[PDB]
Amino acid sequence: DIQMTQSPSSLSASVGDRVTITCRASQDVNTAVAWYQQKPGKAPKLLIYSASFLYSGVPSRFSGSRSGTDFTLTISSLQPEDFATYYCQQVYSSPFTFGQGTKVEIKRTVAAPSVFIFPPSDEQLKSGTASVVCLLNNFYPREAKVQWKVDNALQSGNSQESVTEQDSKDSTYSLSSTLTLSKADYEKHKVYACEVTHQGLSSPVTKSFNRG
Amino acid sequence: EVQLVESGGGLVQPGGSLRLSCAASGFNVKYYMMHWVRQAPGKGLEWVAAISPGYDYTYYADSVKGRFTISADTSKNTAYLQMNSLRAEDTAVYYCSRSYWRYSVDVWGQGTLVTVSSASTKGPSVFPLAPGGTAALGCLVKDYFPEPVTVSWNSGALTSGVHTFPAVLQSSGLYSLSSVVTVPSSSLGTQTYICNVNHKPSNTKVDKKVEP
């Protein structure tokens, strides 16, 4: 089986920049190599066919070249919407193998998060469980530290993070931290705080509430 | 329209069988090579199988050989993936795709989600996240299986400033997610905010009003 080794696994580039993405085939595959773009939630779209031919309706920014067993996908000028995983594929011999992919992120200005905290609803507590939700809205870059403190004790292994895909129009991120407790655990403490550290804040931002 | 339409996915028990269908429009499959490609959630593209219906000749990844059978009926313009001995590993969006001769694959279907799990269907519990002049509010969609779930706001009327987070698998083996929206604070008793939650797999439509 032929391996397509794709470099790099991830990259961050500003709009306007040239981007180079590499596939090394472990054997001769002639030109029978193609490049696909896959946006979040979507099927891949063909960009470059037969190693160097631009597929219909695809912007001229996208180009493909071959040097023996090495294949190169180039974006001339990024664009905020080019946020996607790029894969190459070989159709020379079965199995018709895919690269591991390259996640392209758009680099932009630092933007601090708006921080909001939401106490558990009455309804949930009556269900017998307590979920506390901390929102970090519209920030760049992705790297953000969220810490939970109940009665000013740092918590661990009781929060789950989830983060939107980069906005295709303004390249920001939003993130949720959700602290989940028993009703009894929720009602034996008074103070609930998420403390946010991010490059756009001069100092950590804490949003908190007291039950009641 | 040149198009591929996958069907037959859904939630299935480990050890069971599932027949996927790939219905071709705008071309006859006799003259094309038809492929199955899968994506485990968050992972890359793995090529699975291919068939040339005009010659009955078949290709399989070792990962599925013996267990899976790719076939086609040119009189139904449809290719099939018969999946047997299903494993958790086989949980993936299954895409079918078309290639001509030794040319690269050009058209992809939308994909069909196959979830392999012994865990029962479970509708979400929906709970409010009660609220310069911008306020945040949302709903926690908690304790559902399997994926996916849709959230809209104000029956799709409110789209601007909405972030539906990706689901996270909690330790109980149920998913949970928050949809959040940033609105003007002036409208907290003016405008009512409802989130519409559709969990099609459990046939659960839930509408929850959120207000202070």
Q: Which of B104, B140, B169 to mutate to test the interface with A (most CBs of A within 10 A)?
A: B104
Q: Which of A91, A95, A160 sits opposite B104 (nearest CB)?
A: A91
A119 Cβ neighbours under 8 A, 6+ residues apart: A132, A192, A209, A211, B130
Contacts of B162 in chain A (CB under 8 A): none
Are A183 and A189 within 8 A, CB to CB? no
- Element at A126 (helix H, strand E): helix A122-127
Across the interface, whether the CB atoms of A116 and B136 are under 8 A apart is answered yes
Indicate yes or no: CB of A174 within 8 angstroms of CB of B44.
Answer: no
Topology of domain B3-116, per CATH?
Immunoglobulin-like (2.60.40)
| Contact residues, chain A, for B35 at CB < 8 Å | 96
Tell me if A162 and B167 make a contact (CB, 8 A cut-off): yes
Question: Nearest residue on chain A to B41, judged by CA atoms?
Answer: A41
Which residues belong to CATH 2.60.40.10 in chain B? 3-116, 125-210
CB A102 within 8 A of CB A90: no
Report the residue of chain B nearest A132, measured CA to CA.
Answer: B129
Q: Does B177 touch chain A (CB under 8 A)?
A: yes
Q: Which residue in B50, B106, B110 is closest to A94 by CB distance? A: B50
**SS3 state of residue B206:** strand
List the one residue out of B67, B70, B66 whose CA is nearest residue B50: B70
* Location of structure tokens 């037959």: B8
- Cβ atoms of A21 and A37 closer than 8 Å: no
Task: Verify whether the Cβ–Cβ distance B127 to A121 is below 8 Å.
Answer: yes
CA gyration radius, chain A = 23
User: What is the CB neighbour count within 10 angstroms for residue B25?
Assistant: 11
Which residues in B56-69 are b (16+ Cβ under 10 Å) and which e? eeebbbeebeeebb
B29 contacts: CB under 8 Å, gap ≥ 6:
B53, B72, B74, B77, B78, B79, B98
Exposed / middle / buried, residue B88 (Cβ in 10 Å: 0-12, 13-18, 19+):
exposed
CB-neighbour burial class of residue A75 (10 A; exposed 0-12, middle 13-18, buried 19+)? buried
| Alpha-carbon gap, residue A91 to B105, rounded angstroms | 8
- Structural tokens at position A198: 């991010």
Please tell me the distance from the alpha carbon of residue A66 to that of residue A97, in angstroms, as a whole number.
17
State how far the Cα of A119 lies from the Cα of B140, in Å rounded to an integer.
11
Query: Which two three-digit tokens encode residue B190?
Result: 């003016």
Contact: A38, B182; criterion CB under 8 Å: no
Q: Among partner residues B45, B62, B165, which is closest to A164 by beta-carbon distance?
A: B165
Instruction: Please report the domains of chain A, with CATH numbers, ordered by start residue.
Output: 4-107 (2.60.40.10), 114-210 (2.60.40.10)
Residue B166: list chain A partners with CB under 8 A: 162-164
What distance in Å separates the CA atoms of residue B70 and residue A107, rounded to the nearest whole number? 43
Q: Mind telling me how many Å the CA of B33 is from chain A's nearest CA?
A: 11
Q: Hey, is the C-beta of B3 within 8 angstroms of any chain A C-beta?
A: no
Answer yes or no: do B180 and A46 touch at CB < 8 A: no
Residue of A nearest to B58 (CA): A94
Q: Does the beta-carbon distance from B140 to A96 stay under 8 Å? A: no
Q: What number of residues does chain A have?
A: 212
Q: For B125-210, which CATH superfamily applies? A: Immunoglobulins (2.60.40.10)
In angstroms, this model's resolution equals: 2.4
> Who among B50, B110, B128 is closest to A121 (CB)?
B128
B105 CB within 8 Å of a chain A CB: yes
Characterise A157 by phi-psi region: left (phi > 0), alpha (psi -120 to 50), beta (else): left
Q: Which of A85, A99, A133 has the CB atom closest to B140's CB atom?
A: A133
Nearest CB neighbour to A137, from listed B110, B170, B182:
B182
Reading the block at residue B44, the tokens are 């890359």
* CB contact (8 A) between residue B44 and residue A101: yes
